[PDB]
Design a protein around this nucleic acid. Structure first.
Length: 150
RNA sequence: UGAAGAGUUUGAUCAUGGCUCAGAUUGAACGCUGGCGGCAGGCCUAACACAUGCAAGUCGAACGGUAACAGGAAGAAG
């Protein structure tokens, strides 16, 4: 099973020889609640095709997150194009205390106990890239022990 | 046990960046409405000016006393 959810959609335009034509972009995140998430960004002349193109973009480009138990291994930082996010693990029963694209990425990826904030520009494309980036760089004790000690 | 963001500059973009909004609070005030209780709070302004009453007495077991009250001892009377 893969959770789906749209983040945002807007109505980019382009000035043509005569008037000005229109498109739509949609940003979607896909995951399974077991530490895999991916985002997608499709453009189309109409919203539903933009959303679908986004969803197939998102079902490829799935990463692996090394979750702990529904929360994060350790506090993690992410940046992308002037968008800095901070996630840290929480206690059980603490929800997804997260913002916009933060909440959606953390949800579909299978996190339940996070404590997140986004600092720079909160443009969803960039905050979702920042969040995915932070999550994919997270270390669990297994690989850190593997890479250095026991 | 602990941390959410949104809107607005462009034909559109991404940054910057301000403005504005969603929260909590109060010795509050105002507007509309108003049943009961419990518990609390109530001049933030003019350390402005103040009528009236009250807010510091008590002790005769310190003292001369004995005004005043009530008693005693009488006296003189009915």
């Amino acid at each position: 099973e893969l959770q789906e959810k749209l983040i945002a959609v807007n109505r980019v335009s382009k000035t043509v020889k005569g008037g000005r034509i229109f498109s739509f972009t949609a940003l979607t995140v896909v995951g399974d609640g077991n530490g895999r998430v991916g985002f997608g960004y499709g453009k189309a002349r109409e919203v539903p095709a933009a959303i679908q193109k986004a969803m197939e973009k998102a079902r490829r480009n799935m990463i692996n997150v090394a979750l702990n138990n529904g929360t994060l291994q350790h506090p993690v930082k992410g940046v992308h194009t002037g968008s800095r996010v901070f996630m840290q693990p929480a206690s059980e029963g603490t929800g997804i205390i997260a913002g916009g694209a933060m909440r959606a990425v953390l949800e579909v990826a299978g996190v339940h106990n996070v404590l997140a904030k986004a600092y720079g520009s909160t443009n969803p494309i960039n905050v979702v890239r920042a969040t995915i980036d932070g999550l994919e760089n997270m270390n669990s004790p297994e690989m850190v022990a593997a890479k250095r000690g026991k």
